Chain length 467, copies 2
Amino acid sequence: KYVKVQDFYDQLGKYVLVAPGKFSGTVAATDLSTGWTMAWLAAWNYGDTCPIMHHMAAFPSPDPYKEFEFVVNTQGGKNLFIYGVPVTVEDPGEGMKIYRIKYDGTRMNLQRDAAEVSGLGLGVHVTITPEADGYAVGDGQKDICAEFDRETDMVRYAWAFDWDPNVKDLKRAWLDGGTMTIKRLKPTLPGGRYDLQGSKGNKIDWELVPGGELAIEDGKVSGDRPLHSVANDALVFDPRGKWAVASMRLPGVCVVFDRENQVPVAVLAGPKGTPSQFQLVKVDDDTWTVDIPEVISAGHQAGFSPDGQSFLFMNSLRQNNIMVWDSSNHDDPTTWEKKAVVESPDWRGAYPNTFHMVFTPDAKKIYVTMWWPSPTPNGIAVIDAVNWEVLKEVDLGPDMHTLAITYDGKFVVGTLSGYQNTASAIVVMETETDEVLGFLPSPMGHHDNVIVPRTLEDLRISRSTTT
Amino acid sequence: KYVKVQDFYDQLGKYVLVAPGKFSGTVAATDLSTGWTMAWLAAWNYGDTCPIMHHMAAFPSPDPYKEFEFVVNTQGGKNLFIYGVPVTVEDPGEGMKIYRIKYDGTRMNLQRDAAEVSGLGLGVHVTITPEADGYAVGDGQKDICAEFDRETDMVRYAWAFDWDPNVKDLKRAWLDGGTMTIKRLKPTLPGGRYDLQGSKGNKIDWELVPGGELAIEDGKVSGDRPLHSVANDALVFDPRGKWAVASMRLPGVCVVFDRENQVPVAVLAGPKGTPSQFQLVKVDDDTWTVDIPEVISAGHQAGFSPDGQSFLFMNSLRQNNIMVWDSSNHDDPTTWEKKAVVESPDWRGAYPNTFHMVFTPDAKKIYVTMWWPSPTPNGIAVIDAVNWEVLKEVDLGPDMHTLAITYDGKFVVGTLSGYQNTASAIVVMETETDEVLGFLPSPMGHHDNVIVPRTLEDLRISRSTTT
Ligand SMILES: [Cu+2]
Ligand SMILES: [Cu+2]
Ligand SMILES: [Cu+2]
Ligand SMILES: [Cu+2]
Ligand SMILES: [Cu+2]
Ligand SMILES: [Cu+2]
Ligand SMILES: [Cu+2]
Ligand SMILES: [Cu+2]
Ligand SMILES: [Cu+2]
Ligand SMILES: [Cu+2]
Ligand SMILES: [Cu+2]
Ligand SMILES: [Cu+2]
């Protein structure tokens, strides 16, 4: 007579979902085989006075139910004021913490703040290296990305990015083009430490919010140096090793870095109607520039296919599409050429934006969230990643963020986050016939989620290769 | 082929679950008809520096999906240090806030702190009056309970309780008996306000935790006046009106109050081996005493059946049972006589404790949580509330707290809370054949939960009549 929710979980397999909660100040692991929260952690318990829990990634574990480690970062200061919540803390903590947490099979344990260890505080995307020997973080207020060692939490390399606009007016600073500088960042304090915790290095006093990139042109984003912003977002990894790609939202480019030799090698041009690449110019052993005649569109989410054959960059607002490069030539990224653009006649307005992504293990399909401001339903576009065409779009609810996939490829698990004030949930979609199976409660404002990987192979479709 | 979790929710009906998160610092409403979190609120966003979100109760709403109001309180100070979390907060807030929150069909809105309005801060059970015209709060650190007006958030009446032990040694202070004073508590500040916000009035510097009543005897609970503690817990309401009952954990008694005439009328004696009642002695128009020769056992949870015919008090630790009075005589509580004791040969050790409860609408069954410290599975006892016998016990998981019931009587919805550091969930049990249907994720340390009532009749099986 009665339906058991246990029958629903039985089909999903033995997979652990982990997500941060943005304004909730919390992070939580969920057993998809039972519906239990396995453990949660509230950063306010550790004296965090602005625990905006932002991005996260989990290292592979041979058995996540026995133990797994993850990295979750924070934002602070005026980031607290930019969602609909009538917050009262006029002078919050500066955030940019990089927390190391271990689930030990019973509880979450706060290990340390890697920003205190390294001296480098960064507040946007967190990714695991394909070797699971380290992690990377980007930041779009200070325009810095870095790869960190997993054992020591020390910086392996850090890059700072700067914009020199052709026209010194916020309305024209990106549209009329300019020169981006790529600068090696070296430690300045004893013990190989940086002096870049909290708000140190901020060019703008809050993040460019989802869909909000062009507010900076209209003078709506306060800061020391907004004319010089590029809004770095992430450093994603080629699953084949060697390369990391830094995404720059405002100039609409991605920079390909040699991880081992610690140099940039290529600049990918995001907008449809631009060449495959812009020319990287070496100035000195620590300094490169790239000239961009005009920025046709901002961009945001970025990722590799799990076989490394495709590199994707999402153009936003001025164009809404997925730009696709042929990255098949692992030896030389300067050869990576545009091969496709995913477009839809249904992507008509400034919104929706092509947003977060996850590939199937075989790289034949990609799931991409479609983001709108309140109250238009957000949802998932199902994309044929062989012919680069939209198969299907499904309406789900408010403020959709990240997608993960069970490592058998069977279920996509996504987050909806209520713009930090309304309805939020986990969504489950089966990948065989792309039906939405329904929602699980999730009282959190997640801008990220992962399924805990078991193998290095699993990482190729987790928070390593894509945002 | 694939199971849709929407099929599970379809059977539950149009019911709204609400729960506070204790150490999570959050509160959340869940749509049981879809699995969505409807809205959540993080008290740190409103300058709360110790948001231990403790107890809560919701007022009836003709349509909870359009709007509902609820009350949720907080605990603070050294309460932060008594769970397994290795907390690091140098200057925790004092808590004892009484938040008024309104869900407006989109978001939760913080209305005000009733403790600031009234001047009276209380941190344990919150209950709605059976008229839905007010609410009550108890506190076991200050030993005060009060009924508040819904419109003004001002105190209607407040009672302070004090213990005078026969033996001035914490080991013997309750076992060897004493005299409890019941004192009318009057305001001291302009506008009829109390001076009892935050830690003001604390006799002990932290709560007696679930199953932890004994710690005070062993000198393990610091405070100004622990020898004078009674650990008031709740003020529950007779669904027929007129009477409110204050539960006292340490002396093992409940005090019946005349709400309108603002006087105590009866003292119910909890332990098996005590009479139905102890003698209430009037000292003056503001002061009553009751002599207790020996406290045989502490007690905790308390409640009326929905028809008001039965009153229940749970004896804990020294005895684990449910003491049941015949409360059928609404005109004169001094006539209420013991009529049953729910006992089990399995309840003969210190644990499990008979814990929180919910009745079926027809009062024929009661569901009672059975609490153990880690790692013994906690669960639900299903009780025949006509013959007062245990029908069934089911093992569920760690740290079980409250139960609510859908107002059609079909589904019991309970919370498990991981001792603030491990596994947590919502559990759903169908009441027809008492099968556990399974769990929903809940990344929260809930010591409470409600289903939003629609009618005054619904309140009879919500957070009004019982804890
Ligand atoms: Cu982000
Ligand atoms: Cu300038
Ligand atoms: Cu991003
Ligand atoms: Cu190669
Ligand atoms: Cu997102
Ligand atoms: Cu974000
Ligand atoms: Cu309680
Ligand atoms: Cu004394
Ligand atoms: Cu209680
Ligand atoms: Cu009567
Ligand atoms: Cu409880
Ligand atoms: Cu409690």
